[PDB]
DNA sequence: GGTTGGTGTGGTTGG
């Protein structure tokens, strides 16, 4: 389904405040 | 949790607070995985050495919840247990091997803004994800430090996964593949950690793949809360999947 | 207060 997008985030295009320090984690 | 921030509103929307019915009482986090099933860690259930043996009928669940202990009217959702399955290995005599257990709700909850499932890994999911240096996400009202401090509002911290052999010499306590580590090692300038009340909330990893939050860990153990040379332990959600299919696919 | 703080021409929501 759509397990794993939140309404008020992903659904939105809008970043919460400290998901990209995750994204950089990757790098 | 230790060092971390207030949530934003519908940060963690899978996030789900364990109540005893009486004494009203929070007892640990929980994430809920579909409408009807909610995931949890089995010693916030079961835990002979304190006297803890809940069955469904002493517990609720709350859903959408932001504030601790405010009830957050036309926001959280309360749903009753149908049935709790703990795994049938979970080990509380020694080191809360597969420290994992499921939850039926009696009614499905419908979803909202506050209100949305996490994802579970697959194979592929869990072979990229959990690496050691990778960030997750740890999000709970538990303890705001060791005792030996409650927040107002859920708190959330991001914290490195941690190389196996370092979480084994952090500790005598026998690690197993059901487990992994996460923290801050001492001299990396930043902190944070779980804490007591935590327990059964998720760790959690934004896929760079298709930009899904999955569920890798399930907050279990630790020794103190924050302290240097030591990190926190959870749940190794993959490597009990088989269980946690089994258990749906046979009792929905 | 209330299944609930401390303030709302609410808020993550009424009166
Ligand atoms: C029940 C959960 O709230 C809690 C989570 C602790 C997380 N700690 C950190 N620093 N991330 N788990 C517990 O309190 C578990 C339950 C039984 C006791 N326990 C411990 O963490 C002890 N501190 C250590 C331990 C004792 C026996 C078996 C395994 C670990
Ligand atoms: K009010
Ligand atoms: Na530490």
């Not at chain 2, 370092?166 to 944070?192: H, L, Q, W």
């Not at chain 2, 020794?223 to 959600?237: A, I, L, M, Q, S």
């Amino acid at each position: 389904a759509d397990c794993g997008l939140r309404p008020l985030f992903e659904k939105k295009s809008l970043e919460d405040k400290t998901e990209r320090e995750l994204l950089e984690s990757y790098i | 949790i230790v060092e971390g921030s207030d949530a934003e509103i519908g940060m963690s929307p899978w996030q789900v607070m364990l109540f005893r019915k009486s004494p009203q009482e929070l007892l640990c986090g929980a994430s809920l995985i579909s409408d009807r099933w909610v995931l949890t860690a089995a010693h916030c259930l079961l835990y002979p050495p304190w006297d803890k043996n809940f069955t469904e009928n002493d517990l609720l669940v709350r859903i959408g919840k932001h504030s601790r202990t405010r009830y957050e009217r036309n926001i959280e959702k309360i749903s009753m247990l149908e049935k709790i399955y703990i795994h049938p290995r979970y080990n509380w005599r020694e080191n809360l091997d597969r420290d994992i257990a499921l939850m039926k709700l009696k009614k499905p909850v419908a979803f909202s803004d506050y209100i949305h499932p996490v994802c579970l890994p697959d194979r592929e999911t869990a072979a990229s994800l959990l690496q050691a240096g990778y960030k997750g996400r740890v999000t709970g009202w538990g303890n705001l430090k060791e005792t030996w401090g409650q927040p107002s509002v859920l708190q959330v911290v991001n914290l490195p996964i941690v190389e196996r052999p370092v979480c084994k010499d952090s500790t005598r306590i026998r690690i197993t593949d059901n487990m992994f580590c996460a923290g801050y090692k001492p001299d990396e300038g930043k902190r944070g950690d779980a804490c007591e009340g935590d327990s059964g909330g998720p760790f959690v990893m934004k896929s760079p793949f298709n930009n899904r939050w999955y569920q890798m860990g399930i907050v279990s153990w630790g020794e103190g809360c924050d302290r240097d040379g030591k990190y926190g332990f959870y749940t190794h959600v993959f490597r009990l999947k088989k269980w946690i299919q089994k258990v749906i696919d046979q009792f929905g």
